[PDB]
Motif scaffolding. Structure first.
Motif, mmCIF file in Angstrom:
data_model
loop_
_atom_site.group_PDB
_atom_site.id
_atom_site.type_symbol
_atom_site.label_atom_id
_atom_site.label_comp_id
_atom_site.label_asym_id
_atom_site.label_seq_id
_atom_site.Cartn_x
_atom_site.Cartn_y
_atom_site.Cartn_z
ATOM 1 N N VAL A 121 36.748 103.882 35.566
ATOM 2 C CA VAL A 121 37.019 104.808 35.167
ATOM 3 C C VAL A 121 38.584 105.418 35.027
ATOM 4 O O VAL A 121 39.257 105.443 34.991
ATOM 5 C CB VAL A 121 36.600 105.509 37.346
ATOM 6 N N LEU A 122 39.339 104.309 35.912
ATOM 7 C CA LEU A 122 40.710 104.299 36.120
ATOM 8 C C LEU A 122 41.163 104.269 34.624
ATOM 9 O O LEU A 122 41.986 104.425 34.126
ATOM 10 C CB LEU A 122 40.940 102.984 37.567
ATOM 11 N N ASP A 123 40.772 102.801 34.019
ATOM 12 C CA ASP A 123 40.795 102.484 33.108
ATOM 13 C C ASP A 123 40.721 103.355 31.957
ATOM 14 O O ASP A 123 41.189 103.474 30.538
ATOM 15 C CB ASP A 123 39.864 100.998 32.113
ATOM 16 N N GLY A 182 35.930 100.972 48.803
ATOM 17 C CA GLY A 182 35.635 99.957 48.873
ATOM 18 C C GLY A 182 37.229 99.304 48.790
ATOM 19 O O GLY A 182 37.996 99.367 48.718
ATOM 20 N N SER A 183 37.071 97.952 48.638
ATOM 21 C CA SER A 183 37.295 97.247 48.521
ATOM 22 C C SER A 183 38.493 97.014 47.718
ATOM 23 O O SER A 183 38.350 96.766 46.442
ATOM 24 C CB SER A 183 37.220 95.256 48.936
ATOM 25 N N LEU A 184 39.405 97.460 47.555
ATOM 26 C CA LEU A 184 40.176 98.103 46.033
ATOM 27 C C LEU A 184 41.470 96.547 45.655
ATOM 28 O O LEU A 184 42.112 96.307 46.631
ATOM 29 C CB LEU A 184 40.922 98.908 46.348
ATOM 30 N N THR A 185 41.394 96.140 44.603
ATOM 31 C CA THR A 185 42.276 95.506 44.426
ATOM 32 C C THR A 185 43.752 95.951 44.057
ATOM 33 O O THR A 185 43.740 97.000 43.984
ATOM 34 C CB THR A 185 42.342 94.596 42.511
ATOM 35 N N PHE A 242 46.721 100.626 42.387
ATOM 36 C CA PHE A 242 48.398 101.055 41.713
ATOM 37 C C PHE A 242 47.701 102.303 40.646
ATOM 38 O O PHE A 242 49.152 102.950 40.250
ATOM 39 C CB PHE A 242 48.480 99.689 41.007
ATOM 40 N N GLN A 243 46.475 101.920 40.224
ATOM 41 C CA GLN A 243 46.074 103.233 39.479
ATOM 42 C C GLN A 243 45.702 104.339 39.906
ATOM 43 O O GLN A 243 45.868 105.641 39.882
ATOM 44 C CB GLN A 243 44.513 102.449 38.423
ATOM 45 N N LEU A 244 45.273 104.343 41.135
ATOM 46 C CA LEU A 244 45.003 104.780 41.467
ATOM 47 C C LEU A 244 46.134 106.584 42.701
ATOM 48 O O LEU A 244 46.182 107.789 42.191
ATOM 49 C CB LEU A 244 44.055 104.964 43.097
#
Lengths: 394, 15
Positions: free
Chosen positions: A16-18, A41-44, A49-51
């Motif tokens: 979704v982000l990409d 969840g556990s976001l990288t 950064f994208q959100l």
RNA sequence: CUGUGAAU
């Protein structure tokens, strides 16, 4: 929804982000539902950064999502994730967020959904930057519309609840303006704003944590607003919404000094008239319940002997109030107060005097009148309650 | 406002 | 013979 994600799938958040299609996911009933669970969840570091960039980093998309029935939830989630992400972009992101909201403060406050982004930001952002959000509030007639708005009134109440008084002292003086006070207090929502402000300006148990300098600021602001309120308590006490404000002042122990002022300014010499009002009779009830003893004696004397009986029928003020559809609740209050005193449930000492002998006098008056009128009183629920109250005493 | 009209009485003078 | 106040 884009076709590459089709109805639903086993989608990845990075997909979704990409993709560049976050916006059409966040305004979708099923898409925003997927994003609300994905961001938990556990976001990288990059996914965050994208959100940050896509949800609270582009002003127009941030405004569109904040004013969206579903997207406003995603904005609050991402704001919380941003505040919990103590990286080197932390300062830049909170500053960008404050500038975004401040630039559209009024319209976001009046929006059913964007006003939730405001309130969430006011209580969760660092205190320093949240204070700058208050500076963006309007100072003209749009503040009136905000205080009386079904949505924006909760923004003001949120400011009062979580921001130091120094930053919203202008709202107190704005509301205290006589013309503004009339519009706001006579509104279903504006009256909640005014009462919430009064409660925050009260030196009760919820304010013992204030410094002395903050207590003085609180006291001075309270005195300016109480001056405005007591200057017009007559029209406020009879109003369908502002009567709750007069009640709160009269019944609050930490506002006891303003009891004598309110009772003397608009209640005394009007007890018979106000006791027959749908809204003001509640104020009269509260005034009897919490009046100082020396003032309570004056209220009792006004009901028992403050009025000349009707020249044709001999009907007096007690007769009118006792059988009135609203005044009977006031007379019941008078009787319950006196019975509580003689039985010990209410203390009778004040100012070096023991007013017990005076409570016994007023109870004797009410017992004497209830006895004579026992047949008329027995027709009514209020009358049967007065008779039963007296019988319980013996 | 389907209420009965108020019954007012003359106030005693104040000093 | 009972009597009045908030928006996902």
């Amino acid at each position: 929804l884009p076709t590459w994600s089709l109805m639903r799938s086993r989608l990845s958040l990075s997909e979704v982000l990409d993709s560049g299609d976050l916006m059409k996911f966040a305004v979708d009933k099923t898409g925003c539902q997927f994003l609300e669970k994905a961001v938990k969840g556990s976001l990288t570091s990059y996914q965050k950064f994208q959100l940050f960039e896509q949800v609270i980093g582009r002003k127009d998309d941030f405004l569109k999502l904040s004013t969206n029935i579903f997207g406003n939830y995603l904005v609050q989630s991402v704001i919380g994730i941003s505040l919990a992400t103590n990286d080197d972009g932390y300062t830049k992101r909170q500053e960008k967020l404050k500038n975004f909201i401040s630039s559209q403060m009024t319209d976001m406050c009046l929006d059913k959904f964007a006003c939730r982004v405001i309130q969430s930001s006011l209580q969760n952002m660092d205190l320093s930057l949240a204070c700058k959000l208050v500076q963006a509030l309007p100072r003209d007639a749009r503040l009136i519309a905000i205080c009386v708005d079904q949505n924006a009134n909760h923004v003001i109440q949120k400011v009062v609840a979580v921001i130091p008084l120094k930053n919203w002292e202008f709202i107190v003086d704005f509301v205290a303006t006589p013309e503004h006070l009339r519009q706001i207090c006579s509104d279903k929502y504006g009256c909640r704003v005014v009462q919430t402000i009064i409660e925050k300006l009260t030196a009760d148990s919820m304010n013992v944590d204030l410094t002395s300098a903050a207590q003085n600021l609180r006291e001075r602001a309270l005195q300016r607003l109480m001056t405005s309120v007591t200057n017009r308590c007559q029209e406020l006490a009879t109003n369908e919404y502002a009567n709750y404000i007069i009640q709160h002042i009269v019944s609050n122990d930490d506002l006891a000094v303003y009891r004598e002022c309110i009772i003397e300014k608009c209640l005394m010499r009007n007890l018979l008239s106000l006791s027959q009002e749908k809204f003001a009779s509640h104020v009269v009830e509260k005034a009897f319940l919490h009046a100082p003893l020396e003032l309570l004696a004056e209220m009792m004397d006004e009901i028992f002997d403050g009025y000349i009986p009707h020249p044709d029928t001999g009907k007096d003020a007690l007769d009118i109030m006792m059988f009135h559809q609203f005044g009977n609740y006031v007379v019941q209050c008078m009787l319950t107060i006196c019975c509580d005193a003689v039985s010990g449930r209410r203390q009778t000492k004040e100012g070096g005097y023991d007013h017990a002998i005076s409570f016994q006098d007023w109870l004797k008056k009410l017992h004497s009148r209830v006895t004579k009128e026992r047949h008329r009183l027995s027709r009514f629920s209020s009358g049967k309650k007065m008779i039963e109250t007296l019988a319980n005493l013996r | 406002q389907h209420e009965a009209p108020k019954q007012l009485l003359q106030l005693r003078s104040e000093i």
